[PDB]
Design an enzyme around this catalytic site. Structure first.
Site, short mmCIF file in Angstrom:
data_model
loop_
_atom_site.label_atom_id
_atom_site.label_comp_id
_atom_site.label_asym_id
_atom_site.label_seq_id
_atom_site.Cartn_x
_atom_site.Cartn_y
_atom_site.Cartn_z
N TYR A 28 21.07 -1.02 -4.62
CA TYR A 28 22.49 -0.54 -4.53
C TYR A 28 23.01 0.21 -5.76
O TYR A 28 23.96 0.98 -5.54
CB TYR A 28 23.49 -1.66 -4.15
CG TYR A 28 23.34 -1.95 -2.72
CD1 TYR A 28 24.13 -1.31 -1.74
CD2 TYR A 28 22.35 -2.82 -2.29
CE1 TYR A 28 23.91 -1.58 -0.36
CE2 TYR A 28 22.15 -3.10 -0.97
CZ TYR A 28 22.90 -2.49 -0.01
OH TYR A 28 22.57 -2.82 1.27
N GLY A 30 22.98 3.16 -7.87
CA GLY A 30 22.56 4.53 -7.56
C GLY A 30 22.89 4.85 -6.13
O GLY A 30 23.01 3.93 -5.33
N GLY A 32 24.41 5.58 -2.33
CA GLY A 32 24.37 4.72 -1.11
C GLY A 32 23.70 3.40 -1.44
O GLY A 32 23.94 2.84 -2.53
N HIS A 48 30.53 -3.28 -5.38
CA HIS A 48 31.20 -2.05 -5.76
C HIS A 48 31.20 -1.00 -4.66
O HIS A 48 32.26 -0.42 -4.38
CB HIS A 48 30.66 -1.52 -7.05
CG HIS A 48 31.47 -0.42 -7.65
ND1 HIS A 48 30.99 0.88 -7.78
CD2 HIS A 48 32.69 -0.43 -8.23
CE1 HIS A 48 31.89 1.61 -8.41
NE2 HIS A 48 32.94 0.85 -8.68
N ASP A 49 30.07 -0.76 -4.01
CA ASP A 49 30.11 0.18 -2.88
C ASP A 49 31.11 -0.32 -1.86
O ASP A 49 31.89 0.47 -1.29
CB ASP A 49 28.79 0.25 -2.13
CG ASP A 49 27.74 0.99 -2.87
OD1 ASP A 49 27.78 1.08 -4.12
OD2 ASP A 49 26.82 1.46 -2.15
N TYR A 52 34.63 0.38 -2.83
CA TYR A 52 34.99 1.79 -2.63
C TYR A 52 35.17 2.12 -1.17
O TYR A 52 36.06 2.91 -0.80
CB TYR A 52 33.94 2.74 -3.24
CG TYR A 52 34.25 3.11 -4.66
CD1 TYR A 52 34.82 2.18 -5.54
CD2 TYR A 52 33.98 4.41 -5.15
CE1 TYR A 52 35.11 2.52 -6.84
CE2 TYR A 52 34.27 4.74 -6.47
CZ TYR A 52 34.83 3.78 -7.30
OH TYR A 52 35.14 4.04 -8.60
N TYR A 73 42.64 7.03 -13.10
CA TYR A 73 43.63 6.00 -13.21
C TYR A 73 43.81 5.84 -14.70
O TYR A 73 43.14 6.53 -15.49
CB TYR A 73 43.12 4.68 -12.60
CG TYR A 73 41.66 4.32 -12.93
CD1 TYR A 73 41.33 3.79 -14.17
CD2 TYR A 73 40.64 4.48 -11.98
CE1 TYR A 73 40.00 3.43 -14.49
CE2 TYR A 73 39.28 4.12 -12.27
CZ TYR A 73 38.99 3.60 -13.53
OH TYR A 73 37.69 3.24 -13.89
N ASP A 99 36.36 -0.86 -10.34
CA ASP A 99 35.50 -0.49 -11.46
C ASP A 99 35.51 -1.65 -12.46
O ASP A 99 34.46 -2.12 -12.91
CB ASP A 99 35.94 0.84 -12.12
CG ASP A 99 35.80 2.04 -11.22
OD1 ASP A 99 36.33 3.11 -11.61
OD2 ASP A 99 35.19 1.95 -10.12
C1 LIG Z 1 26.79 1.54 -10.83
C2 LIG Z 1 26.00 2.84 -10.83
C3 LIG Z 1 25.70 3.31 -12.24
C4 LIG Z 1 26.89 3.13 -13.20
C5 LIG Z 1 27.04 4.25 -14.25
C6 LIG Z 1 26.28 5.54 -13.94
C7 LIG Z 1 26.24 5.82 -12.45
C8 LIG Z 1 27.65 5.66 -11.84
C9 LIG Z 1 27.81 4.68 -10.62
C10 LIG Z 1 26.87 4.87 -9.38
C11 LIG Z 1 27.37 5.92 -8.37
C12 LIG Z 1 26.37 7.08 -8.16
C13 LIG Z 1 26.49 8.13 -9.28
C14 LIG Z 1 27.70 9.01 -9.06
C15 LIG Z 1 27.23 10.44 -8.99
C16 LIG Z 1 27.89 11.14 -7.81
O1 LIG Z 1 29.07 11.56 -8.00
O2 LIG Z 1 27.20 11.25 -6.76
CA LIG Z 2 44.93 9.91 -10.37
CA LIG Z 3 25.47 2.58 -4.43
#
Ligand SMILES: CCCCCCCCCCCCCCCC(=O)O
Ligand SMILES: [Ca+2]
Ligand SMILES: [Ca+2]
Ligand SMILES: CCCCCCCCCCCCCCCC(=O)O
Ligand SMILES: [Ca+2]
Lengths: 124, 124
Positions: A28, A30, A32, A48-49, A52, A73, A99
């Site tokens: 999870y 990275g 999806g 977290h997913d 969101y 925010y 977050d």
């Molecule tokens: C919890 C994932 C990693 C935390 C810090 C770095 C990656 C951010 C969070 C994961 C979401 C996927 C990366 C976002 C990139 C996107 O906008 O597709």
């Molecule tokens: Ca805002």
């Molecule tokens: Ca994810």
């Protein structure tokens, strides 16, 4: 927004390179995700997913490009402690808490380097 | 968001009580507005209303309660200078610039105390 989450992570765990440490971890952490998280850490990302996904479903919230990561925010970091500003609007506050709960959660999960860069097609 | 604008004002003019100094000034400083602004200051507020009116019209921007004042962006103040963070999304950046151009503008306008608490039904 994404960059604020990365630095909340850097707030709750000062030794960390967020991208390098928690992107491409487990099932999870990275983009999806699939299957069942592999440890507490991964579970943190799945939550977290979900968070969101929930926020996308408050019919009052219309995120730019449909992506809550685009939404800034207000928050601050003081001695490892994260505080979401109460003057964030309802949508901003939801994201902010997602977050926050996730930087705190990451900070408490065991980090298993076997699990970084997982073969997902197979273990997820 | 509103509170961030109030403190951008406090950034560009350090002696100020934003609410006390620039709310209920002229024809445009304070809710809606009418007629023609009475001085450069008031003109600053009218431009600001217009700016917000424009931002409401970027069909990609859906503000909470339809009010751009609810939208938090990221910015910082350093030595009287305001900087809008580039990582603000497109909508956040628009608002941020509206507020910025208005704290700067206020900072350059002559303050006429005859004009604070104006009889608007009559002069506006
Ligand atoms: C919890 C994932 C990693 C935390 C810090 C770095 C990656 C951010 C969070 C994961 C979401 C996927 C990366 C976002 C990139 C996107 O906008 O597709
Ligand atoms: Ca805002
Ligand atoms: Ca994810
Ligand atoms: C430029 C107006 C005054 C500046 C600082 C204090 C007032 C904020 C800006 C004017 C907008 C009207 C006040 C907002 C209150 C509201 O949400 O209706
Ligand atoms: Ca006005």
């Amino acid at each position: 927004a994404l960059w604020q989450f990365r630095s909340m992570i850097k707030c709750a765990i000062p030794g960390s390179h967020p991208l390098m440490d928690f992107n491409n971890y487990g099932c999870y952490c990275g983009l999806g995700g699939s299957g069942t998280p592999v440890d507490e850490l991964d579970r943190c990302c799945e939550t977290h997913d979900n968070c969101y996904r929930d926020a996308k479903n408050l019919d009052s919230c219309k995120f730019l490009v449909d992506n809550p990561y685009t939404e800034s925010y207000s928050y601050s970091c003081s001695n490892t402690e994260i505080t979401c500003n109460s003057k964030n609007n309802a949508c901003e506050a939801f994201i902010c808490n997602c977050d926050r709960n996730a930087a705190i959660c990451f900070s408490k999960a065991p980090y298993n380097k076997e699990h970084k860069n997982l073969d997902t097609k197979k273990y997820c």
